[PDB]
């Protein structure tokens, strides 16, 4: 049970990618603001499916 | 020319400068609920 | 390292290593002739 | 309406309100201008 976002991306990797781009993850996960969340970034384009 | 541009505030002092200092202190305190900002003309000079 | 400081990877910002007349020129003409992206600032963790 | 300004007269642009990377959402902390 180490997956995020109702997909198969792991919890280690979602932490690293939300910290590499946004400094988000040690004080809670949330939606980054749109000026930090650019087009070629992680959370703009991450699309979990089932 | 220049004496009437400073009168009509086309070129001269900003509203922080020509207004009386009691009115500027009033306009900063009441700024959140009773704004006096768009009542006075600030000249920008090239 | 003296080569990180020469290439401004670590060290002073552009308000400090540049000549003080150029900093006053780039601060006055900033609204119409910007010299800001011509000089590299270090961001040191 | 006007970007923030310090007064050293000379009239100096203040760097407050600019966007940064924060671990916590910036609207609950500061006003972003």
């Amino acid at each position: 049970g180490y997956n995020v976002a109702q997909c198969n991306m792991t919890k280690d990797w979602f932490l690293v990618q939300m910290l590499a781009n946004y400094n988000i993850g040690y004080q809670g996960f949330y939606i980054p603001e749109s000026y930090k969340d650019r087009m070629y970034s992680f959370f703009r384009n991450f699309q979990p499916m089932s | 020319m220049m004496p009437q541009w400073s009168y009509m505030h086309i070129s001269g002092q900003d509203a922080s400068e020509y207004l009386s200092p009691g009115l500027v202190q009033f306009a900063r305190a009441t700024e959140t609920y009773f704004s006096l900002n768009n009542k006075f003309r600030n000249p920008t000079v090239a | 390292m003296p080569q990180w400081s020469y290439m401004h990877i670590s060290g002073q910002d552009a308000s400090e290593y540049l000549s003080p007349g150029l900093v006053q020129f780039a601060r006055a003409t900033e609204t119409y002739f910007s010299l800001n992206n011509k000089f590299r600032n270090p961001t040191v963790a | 309406p006007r970007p923030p300004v310090e007064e050293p007269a000379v009239e100096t642009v203040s760097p407050e309100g600019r966007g940064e990377k924060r671990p916590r959402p910036d609207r609950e902390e500061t006003l972003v201008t």
């Binding site: - | 000249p43 | 401004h8 308000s15 540049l18 006055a28 003409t29 | 100096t12 642009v13």
Partner: peptide
């Protein structure tokens, strides 16, 4: 001090900031 090159907001020059002279824009940091 090059303040006659700045646009006068009022009676004072609208000088920029000291800290805006450089750049630190870089991909990922």
């Amino acid at each position: 001090n090059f303040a006659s090159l700045a646009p006068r907001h009022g009676s004072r020059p609208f000088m920029g900031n000291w800290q805006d002279i450089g750049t630190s824009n870089m991909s990922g940091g």
